[PDB]
Amino acid sequence: VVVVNKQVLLKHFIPAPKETDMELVTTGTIRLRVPEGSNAVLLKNLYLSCDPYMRMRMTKHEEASYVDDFVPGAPITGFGVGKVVDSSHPDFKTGDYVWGLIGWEEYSLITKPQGLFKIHHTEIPLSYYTGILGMVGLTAYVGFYDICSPKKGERVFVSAAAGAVGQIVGQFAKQFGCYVVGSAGSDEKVNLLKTKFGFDEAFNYKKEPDLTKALKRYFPEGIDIYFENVGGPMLEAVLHNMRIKGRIAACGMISQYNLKPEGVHNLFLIVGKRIRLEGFLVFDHYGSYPEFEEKVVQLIKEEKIKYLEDIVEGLENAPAALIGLFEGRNVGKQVVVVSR
Amino acid sequence: DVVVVNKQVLLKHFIPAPKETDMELVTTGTIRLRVPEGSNAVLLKNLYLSCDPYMRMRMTKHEEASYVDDFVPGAPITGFGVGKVVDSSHPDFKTGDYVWGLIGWEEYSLITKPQGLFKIHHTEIPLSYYTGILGMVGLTAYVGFYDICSPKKGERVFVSAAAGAVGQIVGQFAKQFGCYVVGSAGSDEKVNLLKTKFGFDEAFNYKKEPDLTKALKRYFPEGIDIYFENVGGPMLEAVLHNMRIKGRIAACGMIGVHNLFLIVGKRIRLEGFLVFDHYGSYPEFEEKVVQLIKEEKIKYLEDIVEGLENAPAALIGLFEGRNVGKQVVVVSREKGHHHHHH
Numbered sequence: 302v303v304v305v306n307k308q309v310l311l312k313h314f315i316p317a318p319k320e321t322d323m324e325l326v327t328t329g330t331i332r333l334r335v336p337e338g339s340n341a342v343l344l345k346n347l348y349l350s351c352d353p354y355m356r357m358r359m360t361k362h363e364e365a366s367y368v369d370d371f372v373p374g375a376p377i378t379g380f381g382v383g384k385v386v387d388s389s390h391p392d393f394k395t396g397d398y399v400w401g402l403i404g405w406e407e408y409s410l411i412t413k414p415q416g417l418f419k420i421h422h423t424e425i426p427l428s429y430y431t432g433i434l435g436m437v438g439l440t441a442y443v444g445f446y447d448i449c450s451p452k453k454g455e456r457v458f459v460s461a462a463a464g465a466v467g468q469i470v471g472q473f474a475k476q477f478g479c480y481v482v483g484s485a486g487s488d489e490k491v492n493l494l495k496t497k498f499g500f501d502e503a504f505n506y507k508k509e510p511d512l513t514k515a516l517k518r519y520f521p522e523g524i525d526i527y528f529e530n531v532g533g534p535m536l537e538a539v540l541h542n543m544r545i546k547g548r549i550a551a552c553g554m555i556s557q558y559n560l561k562p563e564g565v566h567n568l569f570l571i572v573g574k575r576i577r578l579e580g581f582l583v584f585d586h587y588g589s590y591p592e593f594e595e596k597v598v599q600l601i602k603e604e605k606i607k608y609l610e611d612i613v614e615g616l617e618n619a620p621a622a623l624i625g626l627f628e629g630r631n632v633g634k635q636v637v638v639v640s641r
Numbered sequence: 642d643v644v645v646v647n648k649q650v651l652l653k654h655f656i657p658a659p660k661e662t663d664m665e666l667v668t669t670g671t672i673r674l675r676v677p678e679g680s681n682a683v684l685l686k687n688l689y690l691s692c693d694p695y696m697r698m699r700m701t702k703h704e705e706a707s708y709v710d711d712f713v714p715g716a717p718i719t720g721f722g723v724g725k726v727v728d729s730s731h732p733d734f735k736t737g738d739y740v741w742g743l744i745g746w747e748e749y750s751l752i753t754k755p756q757g758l759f760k761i762h763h764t765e766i767p768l769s770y771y772t773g774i775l776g777m778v779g780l781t782a783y784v785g786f787y788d789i790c791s792p793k794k795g796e797r798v799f800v801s802a803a804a805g806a807v808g809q810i811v812g813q814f815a816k817q818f819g820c821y822v823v824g825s826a827g828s829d830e831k832v833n834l835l836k837t838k839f840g841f842d843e844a845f846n847y848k849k850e851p852d853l854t855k856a857l858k859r860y861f862p863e864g865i866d867i868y869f870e871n872v873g874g875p876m877l878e879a880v881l882h883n884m885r886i887k888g889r890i891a892a893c894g895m896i897g898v899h900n901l902f903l904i905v906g907k908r909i910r911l912e913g914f915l916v917f918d919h920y921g922s923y924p925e926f927e928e929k930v931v932q933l934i935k936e937e938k939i940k941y942l943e944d945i946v947e948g949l950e951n952a953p954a955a956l957i958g959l960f961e962g963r964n965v966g967k968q969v970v971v972v973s974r975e976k977g978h979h980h981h982h983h
């Protein structure tokens with residue numbers, strides 16, 4: 302059996318990204334069997350994740366950064382969920398479902414199957430393994446329980462709080478016993494934070510004249526913990542409102558990914574307030590996954606965590622949905638359905 | 642219960658840099674040489690004063706509270722210093738003991754909260770050292786490096802404002818721990834001292850380097866594990882660019898930053914600290930550092946100025962970089978003074 306395999310390719314390096322910086326192609330095929338003699342796994346790709354860090358990979362870097370750049374002319378890759386068609390690797394059998402880095406394509410031959418995780422709970426919707434039970438959820442789990450060193454009762458702020466990482470941090474934090482406030486870019490998202498996601502309070506950053514004062518309002522006694530997804534002047538504001546011994550988990554600074562650079566002027570406050578500002582990367586924490594899968598599956602089962610996906614249908618729509626990320630167009634975790 | 646003259650330096654008023662005229666020596670004041678009846682207080686004859694850069698901030702009025710209370714116009718300047726106990730109604734302090742802690746810019750200070758005085762346990766060390774290397778500055782170095790920097794033998798360490806009081810000590814601590822240590826300073830005379838007196842593996846003049854990012858690449862081909870941060874600003878940008886995965890930045894002081902996102906990719910811990918939170922560490926620190934001095938395994942240069950009347954100048958001087966070493970003011974020599982100097 303040789304079948305058609307559509308692909309989305311990076312046309313070329315970027316210096317914001319445009320939908321034209323990628324190209325769907327239909328003039329390609331794959332054999333539905335793993336090469337003889339390999340330790341490899343062939344996946345039918347079911348779901349894709351759009352993640353902001355994918356932007357960086359579309360630019361060429363002289364010195365090595367944290368992930369390999371994309372190769373022009375080759376498919377885009379990123380997190381996704383797949384079904385095992387064929388396998389010459391012992392830990393994976395035909396009919397198993399998995400998640401991990403795969404190609405923006407209908408079918409991927411995974412030469413390094415050590416970096417695929419087997420899906421242990423079929424009871425759960427498979428798309429969850431793009432986000433809440435995939436990379437994004439684990440990011441939240443590490444960022445909050447580990448980097449933020451939280452303590453019950455502490456005052457927690459979360460930027461980009463309706464996003465995939467944000468919405469999870471908030472719920473983790475409320476269930477730990479913290480006061481949790483979120484910021485987002487639309488009243489629809491703010492509504493979701495207060496009504497679906499259980500946030501003690503939230504507000505629209507686009508519709509607040511002074512971020513520093515806005516935060517003073519929700520944190521009269523200042524902020525103990527800032528889960529940082531956005532960066533820029535929102536960080537300055539937070540710094541102004543941080544409490545002695547406050548902690549900032551630097552998850553991302555998405556405001557800067559396509560800009561060029563914006564400056565932070567408050568940093569000296571980190572001294573007077575004895576703040577720990579610490580970045581982290583989820584790739585370093587895959588060891589914590591098994592415990593995390595169990596915690597979060599139970600949380601879902603018990604209806605004690607909520608999760609909103611933004612779903613887009615068809616591989617052809619993946620470039621748009623990725624670009625859309627950066628303009629706030631996603632309402633929840635951006636997933637692309639390749640086949641169901 | 643004699644009454645004597647007590648000269649004082651007062652803050653005339655709040656400042657919006659400071660001038661010598663923003664302070665005033667006065668001779669009118671007097672003091673009883675006995676702690677009030679019923680108090681648990683300690684009366685000091687003030688021997689030495691420290692000039693420290695953070696004093697500048699206290700000369701400005703702050704609407705919102707910052708880390709230490711502002712100075713009060715009309716009241717003496719206060720800061721770290723060394724004193725001899727004249728009288729005490731507090732059990733842990735006796736007449737003739739020497740101590741350091743916050744005292745007044747004056748000949749005599751009545752200390753109402755003596756829990757924040759540290760006893761001097763080695764009176765054979767020059768007492769002036771307890772302004773700086775064995776006082777607040779040294780401890781700042783001790784905690785900043787051994788604690789906040791979480792160092793490990795062999796790691797590549799950078800220190801800004803390295804010829805300063807804190808910097809100079811961080812560097813030596815770091816060398817003796819087994820680290821490669823490079824310093825930055827603002828004059829070739831200071832760079833010379835870092836390499837020849839202070840034991841730094843390398844150093845350079847930041848004023849005479851066009852690109853700090855490249856400058857640092859040069860001394861750290863494999864990047865920086867640890868940055869002891871005294872300066873801030875673009876020097877921080879540069880460092881961040883040369884930091885290694887899992888690198889650590891101890892924010893001691895700073896005197897816009899655009900590359901903060903790097904903290905994520907490189908998994909950096911940037912952590913501020915304040916020495917007031919670490920007084921518990923003093924006793925162990927005193928022992929380590931005294932031995933280090935006794936064994937001639939740490940070096941230290943003081944800039945000494947004589948007389949209370951010169952303190953304002955020396956503090957201003959500090960802020961314009963004019964001090965060569967830790968800036969001390971001699972208010973009065975302990976009876977029986979016999980330490981040589983230069």
Ligand SMILES: NC(=O)c1ccc[n+]([C@@H]2O[C@H](COP(=O)([O-])OP(=O)(O)OC[C@H]3O[C@@H](n4cnc5c(N)ncnc54)[C@H](OP(=O)(O)O)[C@@H]3O)[C@@H](O)[C@H]2O)c1
Nearest residue numbers: 440464465466485486530552553554555556582583627629
């Ligand atoms: N291991 C890691 O370090 C790790 C792992 C995963 C994610 N991340 C980081 O986490 C952040 C969010 O991840 P996610 O997958 O959950 O993304 P997401 O929040 O689901 O999508 C991006 C969101 O960011 C907000 N946004 C976009 N541009 C913005 C701007 N210029 N200013 C303010 N807000 C903006 C938008 O919400 P608004 O409507 O609120 O504007 C948008 O919904 C990103 O910074 C990403 O790099 C890091």
Ligand SMILES: NC(=O)c1ccc[n+]([C@@H]2O[C@H](COP(=O)([O-])OP(=O)(O)OC[C@H]3O[C@@H](n4cnc5c(N)ncnc54)[C@H](OP(=O)(O)O)[C@@H]3O)[C@@H](O)[C@H]2O)c1
Nearest residue numbers: 781802805806807826827871872893894895896914915916
């Ligand atoms: N607990 C704490 O967190 C704590 C405690 C004590 C001190 N500190 C801080 O540590 C820093 C200095 O402490 P210190 O006692 O050692 O003071 P100091 O270094 O004796 O005085 C500051 C020195 O920094 C250098 N400098 C000034 N502007 C600079 C710039 N723009 N770039 C680079 N270097 C510059 C000057 O010499 P060169 O320009 O020639 O290098 C100057 O002598 C200050 O920020 C101070 O507040 C913090």
